[PDB]
Design brief:
Chain B: This is Epidermal growth factor receptor. Chain B: It is found in: Cell membrane; Endoplasmic reticulum membrane; Golgi apparatus membrane; Nucleus membrane. Chain B: Belongs to the protein kinase superfamily. Tyr protein kinase family. EGF receptor subfamily. Chain A: Belongs to the protein kinase superfamily. Tyr protein kinase family. EGF receptor subfamily. The complex is a heterodimer of chains A (269) and B (293). Chain A has 9 helices and 7 strands. With 269 residues, chain A is of the alpha+beta class. Chain A has a 5-stranded antiparallel beta sheet. In chain A, strand 4 and strand 5 form a beta hairpin. The longest helix of chain A is centred in the middle third of the chain and has 20 residues. Chain B has 293 residues and is α+β, with helices and mostly antiparallel strands. In chain B, the strands form 4 sheets. Chain B has a 5-stranded antiparallel beta sheet with strand order 1-2-3-5-4, with helices on one face. Chain B has a two-stranded antiparallel ribbon with strand order 6-9. Classes of the chains: A alpha+beta (269), B alpha+beta (293). Chains A and B meet through helix 3, helix 7 and helix 9 of A and helix 1 of B. The structure holds phosphoaminophosphonic acid-adenylate ester, adenosine-5'-diphosphate (ADP) and magnesium ion (MG) (2 copies).
Chain lengths: 269, 293
């Protein structure tokens, strides 16, 4: 709930982990001032495309991001301002939830899947209750803290850059409008990823075809392991009108209701 | 740090909810309209599948109000969950600004309209058969623990003169195990307790069934016409019920006024109704006097 500030010499980037849409994530290390200790961290480098020379000083979209802590979100250990912004977080070796469900597939219990639905939902609830909009929620951006604990990552990063199509809501695609309920849409797609064990949304199609496809009434199909009750949720997540879509309170509560009976809502053998 | 388990031991609902794009089906004509929205008759052509399926497309008019469509999604849920020759099934939904339920078309449409337009070419053996099919459909609905809170002739569709099905489900509610009653609407079709206490049960749908069979036996007459929704409670408390239809014998009318008993358990069950109307349908001219047969 307090934002720490690093100087650039305290941080060092060891290996590239991967690049995405916004920034590039390095596995790096922290060596504090006047100490010789190396503490393994995750340093995400965001390039300054503001032109105003954006990131030389701490803005508080930045402290806002830095002043959040919840059991099911990735806490931002510290930030480092400069020509490039550096976001330092814990290095979670278990990796992304996407890769996990892709590797273990059905072998994970239905209880785990429903519970992860719940956890992602309460993380997002914490974020929404504190006015934080994610703008990039996906299965790739949910990391495993524990084999049973998941945390939401890459939140608030999107409004660091100036003004992913398969996780975006229609208003987001058409008018660049991002809301907590657009994050709900994204949540629905994320859960779809989860319960299809890491399937690629709208695989056969091309990015051009997706928004119109959505506007013509078609959706991501019902997952093989999904009861009608669970798919109904994703469906209401993917509503065109925003104020119809569920809120995160309710999403968390209903996935909780389901979690209190895993086999009735998911069928895996 | 997991949710602790409390198993229900109830079967998963593996109903398939199919989703279609609006370009897969066309709207030809209007079949019905109102504040609910509009029902269209149209053609569905699935993608890559090349069958042309005559369909009814129900589209909701107040898209923006949340629970107008909460009610549409519950409706879609129920209609996608049922599977029975005498109940209409959902073929899929189209999610747009407007939700559109899509079902298989029934050429002859509303049954009320049918028993009205074809008033004197209708034998006893069609009417009794219709009663049987409806009782069967409602029996299936009963043992899937969902209550059709709006059973009436308006809501029975006609596939062929010999085959009808049940529809709506816009008010229909699912009852869980150890959920005998539902506490919450067409006043002249409801049971007394549904008017006085807002209680709906499977035995309330039996009252609705009785009124329905009365509509059929009177060839589409209006229940309690001239009597307003305001007062009927009182008439029912005086013991007054619907009149005996001119074609009905004392046994048929006995069964239907048995559907309208105050004690809800004293009313017949759909099981019973299937048995008794099947037994009557084996000799129709003995239970209904309609000449022209
Ligand atoms: N805390 C972390 N611990 C371990 N690996 C991480 C962590 N955060 C991010 N990564 C990895 O960083 C890699 C790429 O980073 P990044 O490009 O920001 O994420 P992404 O998967 O591409 N999603 P996005 O960029 O938001 O569209 C992925 O392989 C992640 O597993
Ligand atoms: N599949 C269908 N085939 C023919 N007619 C239909 C069909 N669905 C609805 N209708 C027409 O609409 C009415 C029944 O629709 P219903 O679902 O009861 O609407 P609501 O629920 O708004 O009352 C009937 O009068 C019937 O003529
Ligand atoms: Mg990421
Ligand atoms: Mg109606």
């Amino acid at each position: 709930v307090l934002a720490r500030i690093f100087k650039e010499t305290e941080l060092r980037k060891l290996k590239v982990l991967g690049s995405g849409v916004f920034g590039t994530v390095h596995k790096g290390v922290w060596i504090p001032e006047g100490e010789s200790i190396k503490i393994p961290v995750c340093i995400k480098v965001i390039e300054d495309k503001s032109g105003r020379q954006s990131f030389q000083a701490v803005t508080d979209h930045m402290l806002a991001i830095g002043s959040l802590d919840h059991a099911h979100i990735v806490r931002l250990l510290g930030l480092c301002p400069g020509s490039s912004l550096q976001l330092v977080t814990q290095y979670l070796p278990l990796g992304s939830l996407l890769d996990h469900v892709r590797q273990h597939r059905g072998a994970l219990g239905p209880r785990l899947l429903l519970n992860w639905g719940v956890q992602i939902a309460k993380g997002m609830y914490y974020l929404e209750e504190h006015g934080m909009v994610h703008r990039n929620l996906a299965a790739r951006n949910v990391l495993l803290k524990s084999p049973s604990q998941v945390q939401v990552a890459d939140f608030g990063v999107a409004d660091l850059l100036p003004p992913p199509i398969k996780w975006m809501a229609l208003e987001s695609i058409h008018f660049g409008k991002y809301t907590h309920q657009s994050d709900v849409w994204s949540y629905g797609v994320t859960v779809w990823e989860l319960m299809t064990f890491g399937a690629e949304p709208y695989a056969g199609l091309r990015l051009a075809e997706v928004p119109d496809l959505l506007e013509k009434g078609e959706r991501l199909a019902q997952p093989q392991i999904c009861t009608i009750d669970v798919y109904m949720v994703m469906v209401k997540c993917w509503m065109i009108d925003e104020n119809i879509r569920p809120t995160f309170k309710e999403l968390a509560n209903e996935f909780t209701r389901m979690a209190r009976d895993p086999p009735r809502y998911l069928v895996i053998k | 740090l997991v949710e602790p388990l409390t198993p229900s031991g109830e079967a998963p609902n593996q109903a398939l909810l199919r989703i279609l794009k609006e370009t897969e089906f066309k709207k030809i004509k209007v079949l019905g309209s109102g504040a609910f929205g509009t029902v269209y008759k149209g053609l569905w052509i699935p993608e890559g599948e090349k069958v042309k399926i005559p369909v009814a497309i129900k589209e909701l008019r107040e898209a923006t109000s949340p629970k107008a469509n909460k009610e549409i999604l519950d409706e879609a849920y129920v209609m996608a969950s049922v599977d029975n020759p005498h109940v209409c099934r959902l073929l899929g939904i189209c999610l747009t600004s407007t939700v559109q339920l899509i079902t298989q078309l029934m050429p002859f449409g509303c049954l009320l309209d049918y028993v009205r337009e074809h008033k004197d070419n209708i034998g006893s053996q069609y009417l009794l058969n219709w009663c049987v099919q409806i009782a069967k459909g409602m029996n299936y609905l009963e043992d899937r623990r969902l209550v059709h809170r709006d059973l009436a002739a308006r809501n029975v569709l006609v596939k062929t003169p010999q085959h009808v099905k049940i529809t709506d489900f816009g008010l229909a509610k699912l009852l869980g195990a150890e959920e005998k009653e539902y506490h919450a609407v067409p006043i002249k079709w409801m049971a007394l307790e549904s008017i006085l206490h807002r209680i709906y049960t499977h035995q309330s749908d039996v009252w609705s069934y009785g009124v329905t069979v009365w509509e059929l036996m009177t060839f589409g007459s209006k229940p309690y016409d001239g009597i307003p929704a305001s007062e009927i409670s009182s008439i029912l408390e005086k013991g007054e019920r619907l009149p005996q239809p001119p074609i009905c014998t004392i046994d048929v009318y006995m069964i239907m006024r048995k559907c309208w008993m105050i004690d809800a358990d004293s009313r017949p069950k759909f099981r019973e109704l299937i048995i008794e109307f099947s037994k009557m349908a084996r000799d129709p001219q003995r239970y209904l006097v309609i000449q022209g047969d």
